[PDB]
């Protein structure tokens, strides 16, 4: 391995072959695992030279070595990615996308993915320089199976970075231009391509209903539900995130998730050994139980109420809090019969046990659910039985003790429950 001084000496030689050998030495330095001297290379002023080498069409080896060196610098901190951008690398890398050498074109795809992945500013700057058209042109083949596997994975990952980040979200016209190609990748049978395609879809659905509608209006929901039942965790995780984002939109958008058969996967999702899967699946359920009464009935018909009782009874606390939200949304919009069925499944006891949690909001969420269930019992004239049930679980002790909680939203709800149904 060369020293930085010897690399600088070789690059300043104005001997193209000496510059090639020095650039390759810099690339090997930047490719080591333990502490690549990225800042030393930047401080030596080598980035503008590397960028100049990207345009030497007659010497494709130095194009590849400098692109690889710049890619490793752009993969570091935001200051290091900025130094690559400040060297003029964005238009130079976009020109390299048309290289007849696949390994050079792939290196440009890789570098632009690192630059765009820094944040919304560099993402939009890459788009302004016109990267989308040559990127999509590399995928303009009738069957993606004819492309090299690693080449296709790099293009998918880079496209997903162009869909990533908010404040602001990517430009609408850029999303519309990318979506048809993204849908192709979402149907390609390669685990890495599927994972990164799902991540891109999860980014595009993380926004207002207009953004969700753009994705739904491509027919990807059935494929997302199919990927939701995959065996690879790197696929289920972004697929579930995308589904969870879609059910935060309108009730019609939520209905297409249900029509695609998503609720049949949730018995295994709500009992998944991975904590994050259970949390996001319960979060997804909370936004479905916030829908119409016929959609709440879909949750009931798929046998998912006992699974919500289970998650509320025993899970990580963050998952249990998502379950409390699911119950409050359920009891807020459900019919009297649906609320009675929820109590019959045993929701009361695990609901009262969580009134001992230190989190303030979950106490308010539970007290709202208890209030909604009493209103269903008032319509049936069965408030006395519910008060007994809440009593025998030890819940009356907690509702009574919650009157000297400091938060003012808790004593009001606790006192109003004590007055109206107990005292």
């Amino acid at each position: 391995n060369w020293s930085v001084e010897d690399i600088v000496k070789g690059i300043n030689s104005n001997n193209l072959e000496s510059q090639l050998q020095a650039t390759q030495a810099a690339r090997k330095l930047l490719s080591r695992e333990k502490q690549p001297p990225i800042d030393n290379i930047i401080r030596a002023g080598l980035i503008p030279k590397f960028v100049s080498f990207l345009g030497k069409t007659d010497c494709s080896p130095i194009q590849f070595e400098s692109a690889w060196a710049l890619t490793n610098i752009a993969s570091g901190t935001s200051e290091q990615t900025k130094a690559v951008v400040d060297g003029g690398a964005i238009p130079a890398f976009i020109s390299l996308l048309a290289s007849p050498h696949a390994h050079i074109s792939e290196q440009a795809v890789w570098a632009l993915g690192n630059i765009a992945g820094d944040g919304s500013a560099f993402r939009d700057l890459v788009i302004k320089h016109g990267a989308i058209d040559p990127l999509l042109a590399l995928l303009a083949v009738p069957d993606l199976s004819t492309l090299a596997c690693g080449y296709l994975r790099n293009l998918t990952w880079t496209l997903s970075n162009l869909c990533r980040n908010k404040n602001p979200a990517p430009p609408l016209d850029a999303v519309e231009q990318i979506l048809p190609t993204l849908v192709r990748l979402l149907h390609h049978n390669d685990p890495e391509v599927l994972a990164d395609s799902c991540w891109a879809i999860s980014y595009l659905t993380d926004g207002p209903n207009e953004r969700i509608e753009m994705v739904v209006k491509k027919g990807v929901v059935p494929q997302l539900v199919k990927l939701l039942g995959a065996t690879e965790l790197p696929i289920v995780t972004p697929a579930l995130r995308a589904i969870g984002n879609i059910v935060t939109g309108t009730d019609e958008q939520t209905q297409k998730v249900i029509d695609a058969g998503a609720l049949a996967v949730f018995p295994s999702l709500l009992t998944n050994p991975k904590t994050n899967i259970q949390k996001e699946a319960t979060w997804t359920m909370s936004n479905i139980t916030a829908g119409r009464q016929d959609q709440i009935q879909q949750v009931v018909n798929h046998g998912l109420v006992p699974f919500l009782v289970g998650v509320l009874s025993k899970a990580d606390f963050k998952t249990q809090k998502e379950a409390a939200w699911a119950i409050t949304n359920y009891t807020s919009g459900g019919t009297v019969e649906q609320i009675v069925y929820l109590v019959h499944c045993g929701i009361i006891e695990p609901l009262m046990n969580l009134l001992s949690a230190k989190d303030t909001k979950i106490i308010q969420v539970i007290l709202d659910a208890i209030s909604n269930i009493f209103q269903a019992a008032e319509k049936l004239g069965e408030t006395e039985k519910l008060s007994i049930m809440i009593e025998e679980c030890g819940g009356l002790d907690k509702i009574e003790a919650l009157q000297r909680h400091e938060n003012e939203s808790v004593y009001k709800a606790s006192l109003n429950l004590i007055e109206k149904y107990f005292s």
Partner: peptide, 5 residues
């Protein structure tokens, strides 16, 4: 309601 998060 829906809790975007």
């Amino acid at each position: 309601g829906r809790r975007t998060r």
